[PDB]
Amino acid sequence: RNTIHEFKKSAKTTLIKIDPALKIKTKKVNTADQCANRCTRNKGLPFTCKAFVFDKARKQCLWFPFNSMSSGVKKEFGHEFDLYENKDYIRNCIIGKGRSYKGTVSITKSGIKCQPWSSMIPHEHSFLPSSYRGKDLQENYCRNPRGEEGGPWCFTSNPEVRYEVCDIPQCSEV
Amino acid sequence: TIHEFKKSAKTTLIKIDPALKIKTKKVNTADQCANRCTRNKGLPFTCKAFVFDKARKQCLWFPFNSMSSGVKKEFGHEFDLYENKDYIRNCIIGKGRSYKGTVSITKSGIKCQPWSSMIPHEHSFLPSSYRGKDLQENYCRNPRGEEGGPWCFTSNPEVRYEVCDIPQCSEV
């Protein structure tokens, strides 16, 4: 029942609340998967678990009723922290051209595994994560960093297909 | 792997538009269909759902799900439908009348009571009286389009019902 692989992971990251009104729960633990299991099950939390952090130095879970996109919360850097966001609270559909898409789909329309943004293999490119802050060019996720009409896309792991659009549905289009 | 899919018992999908690709294979169990779908290895499309035929032991992998235009869900006792959660809208439009995701926890963090239970709470919100509205399992639902969005009867005997905390699509 190790559920940790089902969260979207951000290395070296925790979340801080600006709004002192927002609520946390913390517990000293052994391993990150223990935090994940309690979040998934939502056992003994007085709120809906949308994200958790494992502190590897203090061996603690921090469970949150918010995520990195909620208002009144900001990211904080820390070598000891990993952030895990519950995919049920990361919008999985696209608004407009999907400039703001932060979901984890990482396969193209024709079923090709996306190439990591941090990689120049197979395809050399200049969509370096550091050139596109805010656009979450992480792992091999489908993204639309320049807001082009095609919707989110990725460079492709197939050497013969440089890039392809991914097949992510519009949230609302009647 | 199978737990990142929403399961609909006794259900298959029929494509109307014959241009939509399908892939099928004789297999042993539904778990193997899920694995192939999750990792998406030998599929010329994005696997958004699959059906397991328990009688023929066949996987049917689809680049669509039940909310896709051009497909009909149908009863069939030998089929189970499994829909990839990444393709079931996880945010709410309007009051969330059309919410079909798998969130089953209230805003205060209480596990929902199954719709087909009368314990702790008795109610007239049974599955058949609201066909089309997916009062399945213990999922947060908004069958009548009420103000606060999807909700459920609560497993806490002290709390009859409570809204869940499903975000508006316009929230972010």
Side-chain angles (χ1 to χ4, degrees), chain A residues 5 46-48 50 87 90-92 108 110 167 171, chain B residues 4 44 46 48 85 88-90 103 106 108 165 169 172:
Chain A
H5 73 287
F47 54 78
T48 313
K50 312 195 181 188
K87 286 184 192 182
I90 304 165
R91 189 173 66 222
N92 59 9
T108 70
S110 62
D167 190 6
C171 294
Chain B
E4 23 231 279
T46 339
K48 303 179 181 190
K85 284 172 189 191
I88 299 173
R89 191 190 325 128
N90 65 7
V103 173
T106 70
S108 75
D165 196 14
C169 295
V172 179

mmCIF file with all atom_site columns, all heavy atoms in Angstrom, chain A residues 5 46-48 50 87 90-92 108 110 167 171, chain B residues 4 44 46 48 85 88-90 103 106 108 165 169 172:
data_model
loop_
_atom_site.group_PDB
_atom_site.id
_atom_site.type_symbol
_atom_site.label_atom_id
_atom_site.label_alt_id
_atom_site.label_comp_id
_atom_site.label_asym_id
_atom_site.label_entity_id
_atom_site.label_seq_id
_atom_site.pdbx_PDB_ins_code
_atom_site.Cartn_x
_atom_site.Cartn_y
_atom_site.Cartn_z
_atom_site.occupancy
_atom_site.B_iso_or_equiv
_atom_site.pdbx_formal_charge
_atom_site.auth_seq_id
_atom_site.auth_comp_id
_atom_site.auth_asym_id
_atom_site.auth_atom_id
_atom_site.pdbx_PDB_model_num
ATOM 1   N N   . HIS A 1 5   ? 4.239   7.075  -4.835  1.00 0.00 ? 5   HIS A N   1
ATOM 2   C CA  . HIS A 1 5   ? 4.506   7.189  -6.268  1.00 0.00 ? 5   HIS A CA  1
ATOM 3   C C   . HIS A 1 5   ? 3.352   7.880  -6.995  1.00 0.00 ? 5   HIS A C   1
ATOM 4   O O   . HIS A 1 5   ? 3.487   8.295  -8.143  1.00 0.00 ? 5   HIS A O   1
ATOM 5   C CB  . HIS A 1 5   ? 4.775   5.801  -6.874  1.00 0.00 ? 5   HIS A CB  1
ATOM 6   C CG  . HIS A 1 5   ? 3.550   4.948  -7.011  1.00 0.00 ? 5   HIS A CG  1
ATOM 7   N ND1 . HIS A 1 5   ? 2.923   4.365  -5.930  1.00 0.00 ? 5   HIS A ND1 1
ATOM 8   C CD2 . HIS A 1 5   ? 2.837   4.580  -8.102  1.00 0.00 ? 5   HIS A CD2 1
ATOM 9   C CE1 . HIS A 1 5   ? 1.876   3.675  -6.350  1.00 0.00 ? 5   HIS A CE1 1
ATOM 10  N NE2 . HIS A 1 5   ? 1.802   3.789  -7.665  1.00 0.00 ? 5   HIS A NE2 1
ATOM 11  N N   . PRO A 1 46  ? -7.739  16.799 10.521  1.00 0.00 ? 46  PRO A N   1
ATOM 12  C CA  . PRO A 1 46  ? -8.969  17.613 10.615  1.00 0.00 ? 46  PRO A CA  1
ATOM 13  C C   . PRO A 1 46  ? -9.265  18.452 9.358   1.00 0.00 ? 46  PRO A C   1
ATOM 14  O O   . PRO A 1 46  ? -9.879  19.525 9.448   1.00 0.00 ? 46  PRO A O   1
ATOM 15  C CB  . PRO A 1 46  ? -8.691  18.525 11.818  1.00 0.00 ? 46  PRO A CB  1
ATOM 16  C CG  . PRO A 1 46  ? -7.202  18.711 11.794  1.00 0.00 ? 46  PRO A CG  1
ATOM 17  C CD  . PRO A 1 46  ? -6.638  17.385 11.311  1.00 0.00 ? 46  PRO A CD  1
ATOM 18  N N   . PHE A 1 47  ? -8.840  17.954 8.199   1.00 0.00 ? 47  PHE A N   1
ATOM 19  C CA  . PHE A 1 47  ? -8.950  18.684 6.927   1.00 0.00 ? 47  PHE A CA  1
ATOM 20  C C   . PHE A 1 47  ? -8.631  17.724 5.773   1.00 0.00 ? 47  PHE A C   1
ATOM 21  O O   . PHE A 1 47  ? -8.239  16.574 6.002   1.00 0.00 ? 47  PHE A O   1
ATOM 22  C CB  . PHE A 1 47  ? -7.987  19.887 6.901   1.00 0.00 ? 47  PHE A CB  1
ATOM 23  C CG  . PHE A 1 47  ? -6.554  19.522 7.184   1.00 0.00 ? 47  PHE A CG  1
ATOM 24  C CD1 . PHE A 1 47  ? -5.754  18.933 6.193   1.00 0.00 ? 47  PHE A CD1 1
ATOM 25  C CD2 . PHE A 1 47  ? -5.998  19.762 8.444   1.00 0.00 ? 47  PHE A CD2 1
ATOM 26  C CE1 . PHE A 1 47  ? -4.436  18.588 6.458   1.00 0.00 ? 47  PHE A CE1 1
ATOM 27  C CE2 . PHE A 1 47  ? -4.667  19.420 8.716   1.00 0.00 ? 47  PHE A CE2 1
ATOM 28  C CZ  . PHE A 1 47  ? -3.887  18.834 7.719   1.00 0.00 ? 47  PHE A CZ  1
ATOM 29  N N   . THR A 1 48  ? -8.805  18.203 4.541   1.00 0.00 ? 48  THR A N   1
ATOM 30  C CA  . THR A 1 48  ? -8.499  17.423 3.335   1.00 0.00 ? 48  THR A CA  1
ATOM 31  C C   . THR A 1 48  ? -7.020  17.570 2.999   1.00 0.00 ? 48  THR A C   1
ATOM 32  O O   . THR A 1 48  ? -6.541  18.664 2.755   1.00 0.00 ? 48  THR A O   1
ATOM 33  C CB  . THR A 1 48  ? -9.323  17.943 2.129   1.00 0.00 ? 48  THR A CB  1
ATOM 34  O OG1 . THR A 1 48  ? -10.690 18.107 2.515   1.00 0.00 ? 48  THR A OG1 1
ATOM 35  C CG2 . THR A 1 48  ? -9.228  17.008 0.956   1.00 0.00 ? 48  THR A CG2 1
ATOM 36  N N   . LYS A 1 50  ? -4.193  17.884 0.810   1.00 0.00 ? 50  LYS A N   1
ATOM 37  C CA  . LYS A 1 50  ? -3.889  18.173 -0.600  1.00 0.00 ? 50  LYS A CA  1
ATOM 38  C C   . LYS A 1 50  ? -2.392  18.045 -0.921  1.00 0.00 ? 50  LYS A C   1
ATOM 39  O O   . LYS A 1 50  ? -1.990  18.003 -2.098  1.00 0.00 ? 50  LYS A O   1
ATOM 40  C CB  . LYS A 1 50  ? -4.416  19.558 -0.999  1.00 0.00 ? 50  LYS A CB  1
ATOM 41  C CG  . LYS A 1 50  ? -5.881  19.817 -0.571  1.00 0.00 ? 50  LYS A CG  1
ATOM 42  C CD  . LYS A 1 50  ? -6.482  21.042 -1.296  1.00 0.00 ? 50  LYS A CD  1
ATOM 43  C CE  . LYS A 1 50  ? -7.922  21.288 -0.846  1.00 0.00 ? 50  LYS A CE  1
ATOM 44  N NZ  . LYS A 1 50  ? -8.606  22.353 -1.656  1.00 0.00 ? 50  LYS A NZ  1
ATOM 45  N N   . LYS A 1 87  ? -2.354  14.569 -6.548  1.00 0.00 ? 87  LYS A N   1
ATOM 46  C CA  . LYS A 1 87  ? -2.781  14.847 -7.935  1.00 0.00 ? 87  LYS A CA  1
ATOM 47  C C   . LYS A 1 87  ? -4.270  15.183 -8.061  1.00 0.00 ? 87  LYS A C   1
ATOM 48  O O   . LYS A 1 87  ? -4.678  15.832 -9.028  1.00 0.00 ? 87  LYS A O   1
ATOM 49  C CB  . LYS A 1 87  ? -2.429  13.677 -8.868  1.00 0.00 ? 87  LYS A CB  1
ATOM 50  C CG  . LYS A 1 87  ? -0.948  13.553 -9.211  1.00 0.00 ? 87  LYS A CG  1
ATOM 51  C CD  . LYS A 1 87  ? -0.707  12.436 -10.224 1.00 0.00 ? 87  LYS A CD  1
ATOM 52  C CE  . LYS A 1 87  ? 0.788   12.126 -10.336 1.00 0.00 ? 87  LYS A CE  1
ATOM 53  N NZ  . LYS A 1 87  ? 1.145   11.068 -11.360 1.00 0.00 ? 87  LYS A NZ  1
ATOM 54  N N   . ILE A 1 90  ? -4.405  18.952 -8.196  1.00 0.00 ? 90  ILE A N   1
ATOM 55  C CA  . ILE A 1 90  ? -3.689  19.637 -9.279  1.00 0.00 ? 90  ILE A CA  1
ATOM 56  C C   . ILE A 1 90  ? -4.525  19.516 -10.551 1.00 0.00 ? 90  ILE A C   1
ATOM 57  O O   . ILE A 1 90  ? -4.714  18.412 -11.088 1.00 0.00 ? 90  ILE A O   1
ATOM 58  C CB  . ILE A 1 90  ? -2.278  19.067 -9.536  1.00 0.00 ? 90  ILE A CB  1
ATOM 59  C CG1 . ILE A 1 90  ? -1.422  19.095 -8.258  1.00 0.00 ? 90  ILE A CG1 1
ATOM 60  C CG2 . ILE A 1 90  ? -1.609  19.860 -10.671 1.00 0.00 ? 90  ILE A CG2 1
ATOM 61  C CD1 . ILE A 1 90  ? -0.166  18.211 -8.349  1.00 0.00 ? 90  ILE A CD1 1
ATOM 62  N N   . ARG A 1 91  ? -5.040  20.647 -11.012 1.00 0.00 ? 91  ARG A N   1
ATOM 63  C CA  . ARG A 1 91  ? -6.006  20.660 -12.100 1.00 0.00 ? 91  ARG A CA  1
ATOM 64  C C   . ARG A 1 91  ? -5.480  19.850 -13.282 1.00 0.00 ? 91  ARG A C   1
ATOM 65  O O   . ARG A 1 91  ? -4.370  20.102 -13.780 1.00 0.00 ? 91  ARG A O   1
ATOM 66  C CB  . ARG A 1 91  ? -6.359  22.099 -12.492 1.00 0.00 ? 91  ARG A CB  1
ATOM 67  C CG  . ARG A 1 91  ? -7.521  22.239 -13.464 1.00 0.00 ? 91  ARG A CG  1
ATOM 68  C CD  . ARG A 1 91  ? -7.866  23.691 -13.639 1.00 0.00 ? 91  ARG A CD  1
ATOM 69  N NE  . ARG A 1 91  ? -6.786  24.421 -14.296 1.00 0.00 ? 91  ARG A NE  1
ATOM 70  C CZ  . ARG A 1 91  ? -6.368  25.632 -13.946 1.00 0.00 ? 91  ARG A CZ  1
ATOM 71  N NH1 . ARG A 1 91  ? -6.930  26.260 -12.927 1.00 0.00 ? 91  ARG A NH1 1
ATOM 72  N NH2 . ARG A 1 91  ? -5.380  26.213 -14.614 1.00 0.00 ? 91  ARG A NH2 1
ATOM 73  N N   . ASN A 1 92  ? -6.267  18.852 -13.699 1.00 0.00 ? 92  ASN A N   1
ATOM 74  C CA  . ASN A 1 92  ? -5.832  17.909 -14.750 1.00 0.00 ? 92  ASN A CA  1
ATOM 75  C C   . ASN A 1 92  ? -6.418  18.224 -16.122 1.00 0.00 ? 92  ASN A C   1
ATOM 76  O O   . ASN A 1 92  ? -6.282  17.457 -17.062 1.00 0.00 ? 92  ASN A O   1
ATOM 77  C CB  . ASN A 1 92  ? -6.110  16.442 -14.369 1.00 0.00 ? 92  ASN A CB  1
ATOM 78  C CG  . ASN A 1 92  ? -7.582  16.161 -14.102 1.00 0.00 ? 92  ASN A CG  1
ATOM 79  O OD1 . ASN A 1 92  ? -8.449  16.997 -14.345 1.00 0.00 ? 92  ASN A OD1 1
ATOM 80  N ND2 . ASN A 1 92  ? -7.867  14.956 -13.594 1.00 0.00 ? 92  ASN A ND2 1
ATOM 81  N N   . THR A 1 108 ? 2.808   11.984 -25.326 1.00 0.00 ? 108 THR A N   1
ATOM 82  C CA  . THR A 1 108 ? 2.256   12.729 -26.446 1.00 0.00 ? 108 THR A CA  1
ATOM 83  C C   . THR A 1 108 ? 0.962   12.073 -26.963 1.00 0.00 ? 108 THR A C   1
ATOM 84  O O   . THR A 1 108 ? 0.615   10.960 -26.570 1.00 0.00 ? 108 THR A O   1
ATOM 85  C CB  . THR A 1 108 ? 3.253   12.847 -27.617 1.00 0.00 ? 108 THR A CB  1
ATOM 86  O OG1 . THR A 1 108 ? 3.421   11.559 -28.223 1.00 0.00 ? 108 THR A OG1 1
ATOM 87  C CG2 . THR A 1 108 ? 4.622   13.379 -27.157 1.00 0.00 ? 108 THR A CG2 1
ATOM 88  N N   . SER A 1 110 ? 0.329   10.640 -29.799 1.00 0.00 ? 110 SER A N   1
ATOM 89  C CA  . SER A 1 110 ? 0.541   9.348  -30.456 1.00 0.00 ? 110 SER A CA  1
ATOM 90  C C   . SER A 1 110 ? 1.180   8.318  -29.517 1.00 0.00 ? 110 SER A C   1
ATOM 91  O O   . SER A 1 110 ? 1.599   7.246  -29.945 1.00 0.00 ? 110 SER A O   1
ATOM 92  C CB  . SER A 1 110 ? 1.369   9.523  -31.737 1.00 0.00 ? 110 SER A CB  1
ATOM 93  O OG  . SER A 1 110 ? 2.660   10.033 -31.436 1.00 0.00 ? 110 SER A OG  1
ATOM 94  N N   . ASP A 1 167 ? -2.345  15.194 -25.364 1.00 0.00 ? 167 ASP A N   1
ATOM 95  C CA  . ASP A 1 167 ? -3.767  15.071 -25.588 1.00 0.00 ? 167 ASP A CA  1
ATOM 96  C C   . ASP A 1 167 ? -4.507  15.344 -24.274 1.00 0.00 ? 167 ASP A C   1
ATOM 97  O O   . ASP A 1 167 ? -5.105  14.445 -23.697 1.00 0.00 ? 167 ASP A O   1
ATOM 98  C CB  . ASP A 1 167 ? -4.018  13.630 -26.070 1.00 0.00 ? 167 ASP A CB  1
ATOM 99  C CG  . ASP A 1 167 ? -5.420  13.396 -26.567 1.00 0.00 ? 167 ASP A CG  1
ATOM 100 O OD1 . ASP A 1 167 ? -6.203  14.370 -26.658 1.00 0.00 ? 167 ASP A OD1 1
ATOM 101 O OD2 . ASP A 1 167 ? -5.734  12.215 -26.872 1.00 0.00 ? 167 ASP A OD2 1
ATOM 102 N N   . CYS A 1 171 ? -10.836 22.003 -19.810 1.00 0.00 ? 171 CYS A N   1
ATOM 103 C CA  . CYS A 1 171 ? -11.737 21.922 -18.652 1.00 0.00 ? 171 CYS A CA  1
ATOM 104 C C   . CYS A 1 171 ? -13.198 22.148 -19.056 1.00 0.00 ? 171 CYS A C   1
ATOM 105 O O   . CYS A 1 171 ? -14.087 21.430 -18.598 1.00 0.00 ? 171 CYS A O   1
ATOM 106 C CB  . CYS A 1 171 ? -11.339 22.943 -17.585 1.00 0.00 ? 171 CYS A CB  1
ATOM 107 S SG  . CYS A 1 171 ? -9.723  22.634 -16.828 1.00 0.00 ? 171 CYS A SG  1
ATOM 108 N N   . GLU B 2 4   ? -5.072  3.883  -9.480  1.00 0.00 ? 4   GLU B N   1
ATOM 109 C CA  . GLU B 2 4   ? -5.078  5.218  -10.087 1.00 0.00 ? 4   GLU B CA  1
ATOM 110 C C   . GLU B 2 4   ? -6.120  5.322  -11.201 1.00 0.00 ? 4   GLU B C   1
ATOM 111 O O   . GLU B 2 4   ? -6.114  6.271  -12.013 1.00 0.00 ? 4   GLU B O   1
ATOM 112 C CB  . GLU B 2 4   ? -3.676  5.621  -10.567 1.00 0.00 ? 4   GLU B CB  1
ATOM 113 C CG  . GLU B 2 4   ? -2.754  4.450  -10.840 1.00 0.00 ? 4   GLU B CG  1
ATOM 114 C CD  . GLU B 2 4   ? -1.404  4.583  -10.144 1.00 0.00 ? 4   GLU B CD  1
ATOM 115 O OE1 . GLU B 2 4   ? -0.532  5.308  -10.670 1.00 0.00 ? 4   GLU B OE1 1
ATOM 116 O OE2 . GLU B 2 4   ? -1.217  3.951  -9.078  1.00 0.00 ? 4   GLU B OE2 1
ATOM 117 N N   . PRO B 2 44  ? -0.284  3.007  -29.535 1.00 0.00 ? 44  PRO B N   1
ATOM 118 C CA  . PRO B 2 44  ? -0.102  4.166  -30.428 1.00 0.00 ? 44  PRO B CA  1
ATOM 119 C C   . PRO B 2 44  ? -0.958  5.394  -30.064 1.00 0.00 ? 44  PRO B C   1
ATOM 120 O O   . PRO B 2 44  ? -1.374  6.133  -30.958 1.00 0.00 ? 44  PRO B O   1
ATOM 121 C CB  . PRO B 2 44  ? -0.497  3.624  -31.816 1.00 0.00 ? 44  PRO B CB  1
ATOM 122 C CG  . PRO B 2 44  ? -0.919  2.190  -31.617 1.00 0.00 ? 44  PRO B CG  1
ATOM 123 C CD  . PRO B 2 44  ? -1.123  1.963  -30.155 1.00 0.00 ? 44  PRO B CD  1
ATOM 124 N N   . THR B 2 46  ? -2.472  7.852  -26.173 1.00 0.00 ? 46  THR B N   1
ATOM 125 C CA  . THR B 2 46  ? -2.492  7.971  -24.708 1.00 0.00 ? 46  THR B CA  1
ATOM 126 C C   . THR B 2 46  ? -3.616  7.128  -24.115 1.00 0.00 ? 46  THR B C   1
ATOM 127 O O   . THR B 2 46  ? -4.792  7.369  -24.398 1.00 0.00 ? 46  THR B O   1
ATOM 128 C CB  . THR B 2 46  ? -2.701  9.429  -24.196 1.00 0.00 ? 46  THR B CB  1
ATOM 129 O OG1 . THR B 2 46  ? -2.358  10.380 -25.209 1.00 0.00 ? 46  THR B OG1 1
ATOM 130 C CG2 . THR B 2 46  ? -1.837  9.672  -22.973 1.00 0.00 ? 46  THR B CG2 1
ATOM 131 N N   . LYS B 2 48  ? -6.238  6.354  -21.707 1.00 0.00 ? 48  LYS B N   1
ATOM 132 C CA  . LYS B 2 48  ? -7.028  7.121  -20.746 1.00 0.00 ? 48  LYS B CA  1
ATOM 133 C C   . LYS B 2 48  ? -7.976  6.213  -19.980 1.00 0.00 ? 48  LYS B C   1
ATOM 134 O O   . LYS B 2 48  ? -8.484  6.568  -18.908 1.00 0.00 ? 48  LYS B O   1
ATOM 135 C CB  . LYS B 2 48  ? -7.819  8.205  -21.474 1.00 0.00 ? 48  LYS B CB  1
ATOM 136 C CG  . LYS B 2 48  ? -6.948  9.151  -22.282 1.00 0.00 ? 48  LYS B CG  1
ATOM 137 C CD  . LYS B 2 48  ? -7.776  10.190 -23.000 1.00 0.00 ? 48  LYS B CD  1
ATOM 138 C CE  . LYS B 2 48  ? -6.855  11.093 -23.822 1.00 0.00 ? 48  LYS B CE  1
ATOM 139 N NZ  . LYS B 2 48  ? -7.571  12.268 -24.362 1.00 0.00 ? 48  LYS B NZ  1
ATOM 140 N N   . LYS B 2 85  ? -7.442  8.372  -13.745 1.00 0.00 ? 85  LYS B N   1
ATOM 141 C CA  . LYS B 2 85  ? -7.861  9.566  -12.984 1.00 0.00 ? 85  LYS B CA  1
ATOM 142 C C   . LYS B 2 85  ? -7.316  10.865 -13.549 1.00 0.00 ? 85  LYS B C   1
ATOM 143 O O   . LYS B 2 85  ? -7.916  11.923 -13.338 1.00 0.00 ? 85  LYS B O   1
ATOM 144 C CB  . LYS B 2 85  ? -7.476  9.465  -11.497 1.00 0.00 ? 85  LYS B CB  1
ATOM 145 C CG  . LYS B 2 85  ? -8.334  8.550  -10.665 1.00 0.00 ? 85  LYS B CG  1
ATOM 146 C CD  . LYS B 2 85  ? -7.733  8.374  -9.266  1.00 0.00 ? 85  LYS B CD  1
ATOM 147 C CE  . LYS B 2 85  ? -8.481  7.285  -8.492  1.00 0.00 ? 85  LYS B CE  1
ATOM 148 N NZ  . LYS B 2 85  ? -8.101  7.258  -7.049  1.00 0.00 ? 85  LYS B NZ  1
ATOM 149 N N   . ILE B 2 88  ? -10.149 12.305 -15.759 1.00 0.00 ? 88  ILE B N   1
ATOM 150 C CA  . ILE B 2 88  ? -11.463 12.624 -15.208 1.00 0.00 ? 88  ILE B CA  1
ATOM 151 C C   . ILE B 2 88  ? -11.317 13.972 -14.518 1.00 0.00 ? 88  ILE B C   1
ATOM 152 O O   . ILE B 2 88  ? -10.538 14.108 -13.581 1.00 0.00 ? 88  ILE B O   1
ATOM 153 C CB  . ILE B 2 88  ? -11.934 11.592 -14.190 1.00 0.00 ? 88  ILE B CB  1
ATOM 154 C CG1 . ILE B 2 88  ? -12.046 10.208 -14.837 1.00 0.00 ? 88  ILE B CG1 1
ATOM 155 C CG2 . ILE B 2 88  ? -13.287 12.030 -13.538 1.00 0.00 ? 88  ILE B CG2 1
ATOM 156 C CD1 . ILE B 2 88  ? -12.340 9.107  -13.815 1.00 0.00 ? 88  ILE B CD1 1
ATOM 157 N N   . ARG B 2 89  ? -12.062 14.956 -15.000 1.00 0.00 ? 89  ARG B N   1
ATOM 158 C CA  . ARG B 2 89  ? -11.924 16.331 -14.530 1.00 0.00 ? 89  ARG B CA  1
ATOM 159 C C   . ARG B 2 89  ? -11.942 16.405 -12.995 1.00 0.00 ? 89  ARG B C   1
ATOM 160 O O   . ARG B 2 89  ? -12.918 16.003 -12.350 1.00 0.00 ? 89  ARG B O   1
ATOM 161 C CB  . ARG B 2 89  ? -13.012 17.231 -15.145 1.00 0.00 ? 89  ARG B CB  1
ATOM 162 C CG  . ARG B 2 89  ? -12.757 18.738 -14.889 1.00 0.00 ? 89  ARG B CG  1
ATOM 163 C CD  . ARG B 2 89  ? -13.956 19.634 -15.271 1.00 0.00 ? 89  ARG B CD  1
ATOM 164 N NE  . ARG B 2 89  ? -14.653 19.115 -16.428 1.00 0.00 ? 89  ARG B NE  1
ATOM 165 C CZ  . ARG B 2 89  ? -15.955 18.885 -16.486 1.00 0.00 ? 89  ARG B CZ  1
ATOM 166 N NH1 . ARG B 2 89  ? -16.745 19.163 -15.454 1.00 0.00 ? 89  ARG B NH1 1
ATOM 167 N NH2 . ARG B 2 89  ? -16.474 18.392 -17.599 1.00 0.00 ? 89  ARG B NH2 1
ATOM 168 N N   . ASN B 2 90  ? -10.862 16.919 -12.413 1.00 0.00 ? 90  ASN B N   1
ATOM 169 C CA  . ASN B 2 90  ? -10.740 16.970 -10.949 1.00 0.00 ? 90  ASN B CA  1
ATOM 170 C C   . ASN B 2 90  ? -11.047 18.343 -10.343 1.00 0.00 ? 90  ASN B C   1
ATOM 171 O O   . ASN B 2 90  ? -10.696 18.634 -9.189  1.00 0.00 ? 90  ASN B O   1
ATOM 172 C CB  . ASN B 2 90  ? -9.383  16.433 -10.476 1.00 0.00 ? 90  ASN B CB  1
ATOM 173 C CG  . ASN B 2 90  ? -8.197  17.291 -10.933 1.00 0.00 ? 90  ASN B CG  1
ATOM 174 O OD1 . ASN B 2 90  ? -8.367  18.367 -11.501 1.00 0.00 ? 90  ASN B OD1 1
ATOM 175 N ND2 . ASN B 2 90  ? -6.989  16.797 -10.692 1.00 0.00 ? 90  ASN B ND2 1
ATOM 176 N N   . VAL B 2 103 ? -12.772 11.780 -5.315  1.00 0.00 ? 103 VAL B N   1
ATOM 177 C CA  . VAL B 2 103 ? -12.597 12.330 -3.970  1.00 0.00 ? 103 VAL B CA  1
ATOM 178 C C   . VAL B 2 103 ? -13.735 11.860 -3.045  1.00 0.00 ? 103 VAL B C   1
ATOM 179 O O   . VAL B 2 103 ? -14.919 11.934 -3.401  1.00 0.00 ? 103 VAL B O   1
ATOM 180 C CB  . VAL B 2 103 ? -12.464 13.860 -3.983  1.00 0.00 ? 103 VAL B CB  1
ATOM 181 C CG1 . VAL B 2 103 ? -12.454 14.401 -2.564  1.00 0.00 ? 103 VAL B CG1 1
ATOM 182 C CG2 . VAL B 2 103 ? -11.155 14.254 -4.722  1.00 0.00 ? 103 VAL B CG2 1
ATOM 183 N N   . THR B 2 106 ? -14.594 14.675 3.191   1.00 0.00 ? 106 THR B N   1
ATOM 184 C CA  . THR B 2 106 ? -15.266 15.966 3.395   1.00 0.00 ? 106 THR B CA  1
ATOM 185 C C   . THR B 2 106 ? -14.253 17.081 3.667   1.00 0.00 ? 106 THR B C   1
ATOM 186 O O   . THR B 2 106 ? -13.088 16.791 3.942   1.00 0.00 ? 106 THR B O   1
ATOM 187 C CB  . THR B 2 106 ? -16.248 15.908 4.590   1.00 0.00 ? 106 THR B CB  1
ATOM 188 O OG1 . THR B 2 106 ? -15.505 15.809 5.826   1.00 0.00 ? 106 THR B OG1 1
ATOM 189 C CG2 . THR B 2 106 ? -17.204 14.735 4.458   1.00 0.00 ? 106 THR B CG2 1
ATOM 190 N N   . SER B 2 108 ? -13.736 18.878 6.276   1.00 0.00 ? 108 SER B N   1
ATOM 191 C CA  . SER B 2 108 ? -13.151 18.748 7.610   1.00 0.00 ? 108 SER B CA  1
ATOM 192 C C   . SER B 2 108 ? -12.399 17.412 7.771   1.00 0.00 ? 108 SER B C   1
ATOM 193 O O   . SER B 2 108 ? -11.967 17.051 8.869   1.00 0.00 ? 108 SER B O   1
ATOM 194 C CB  . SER B 2 108 ? -14.226 18.920 8.683   1.00 0.00 ? 108 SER B CB  1
ATOM 195 O OG  . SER B 2 108 ? -15.032 17.757 8.769   1.00 0.00 ? 108 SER B OG  1
ATOM 196 N N   . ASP B 2 165 ? -14.133 19.328 -0.501  1.00 0.00 ? 165 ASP B N   1
ATOM 197 C CA  . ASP B 2 165 ? -13.303 20.497 -0.754  1.00 0.00 ? 165 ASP B CA  1
ATOM 198 C C   . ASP B 2 165 ? -12.728 20.406 -2.170  1.00 0.00 ? 165 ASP B C   1
ATOM 199 O O   . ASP B 2 165 ? -11.527 20.572 -2.382  1.00 0.00 ? 165 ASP B O   1
ATOM 200 C CB  . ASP B 2 165 ? -12.202 20.593 0.315   1.00 0.00 ? 165 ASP B CB  1
ATOM 201 C CG  . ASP B 2 165 ? -11.528 21.962 0.362   1.00 0.00 ? 165 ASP B CG  1
ATOM 202 O OD1 . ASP B 2 165 ? -12.055 22.918 -0.234  1.00 0.00 ? 165 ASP B OD1 1
ATOM 203 O OD2 . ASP B 2 165 ? -10.472 22.074 1.016   1.00 0.00 ? 165 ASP B OD2 1
ATOM 204 N N   . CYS B 2 169 ? -12.722 24.998 -11.047 1.00 0.00 ? 169 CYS B N   1
ATOM 205 C CA  . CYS B 2 169 ? -11.761 25.064 -12.140 1.00 0.00 ? 169 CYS B CA  1
ATOM 206 C C   . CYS B 2 169 ? -11.153 26.449 -12.299 1.00 0.00 ? 169 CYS B C   1
ATOM 207 O O   . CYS B 2 169 ? -10.065 26.576 -12.826 1.00 0.00 ? 169 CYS B O   1
ATOM 208 C CB  . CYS B 2 169 ? -12.407 24.628 -13.446 1.00 0.00 ? 169 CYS B CB  1
ATOM 209 S SG  . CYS B 2 169 ? -12.919 22.882 -13.469 1.00 0.00 ? 169 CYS B SG  1
ATOM 210 N N   . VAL B 2 172 ? -7.541  28.445 -9.700  1.00 0.00 ? 172 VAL B N   1
ATOM 211 C CA  . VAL B 2 172 ? -6.134  28.649 -10.013 1.00 0.00 ? 172 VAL B CA  1
ATOM 212 C C   . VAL B 2 172 ? -6.072  29.248 -11.407 1.00 0.00 ? 172 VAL B C   1
ATOM 213 O O   . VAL B 2 172 ? -6.860  28.851 -12.273 1.00 0.00 ? 172 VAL B O   1
ATOM 214 C CB  . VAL B 2 172 ? -5.338  27.294 -10.024 1.00 0.00 ? 172 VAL B CB  1
ATOM 215 C CG1 . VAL B 2 172 ? -3.879  27.530 -10.366 1.00 0.00 ? 172 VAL B CG1 1
ATOM 216 C CG2 . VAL B 2 172 ? -5.465  26.539 -8.683  1.00 0.00 ? 172 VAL B CG2 1
#
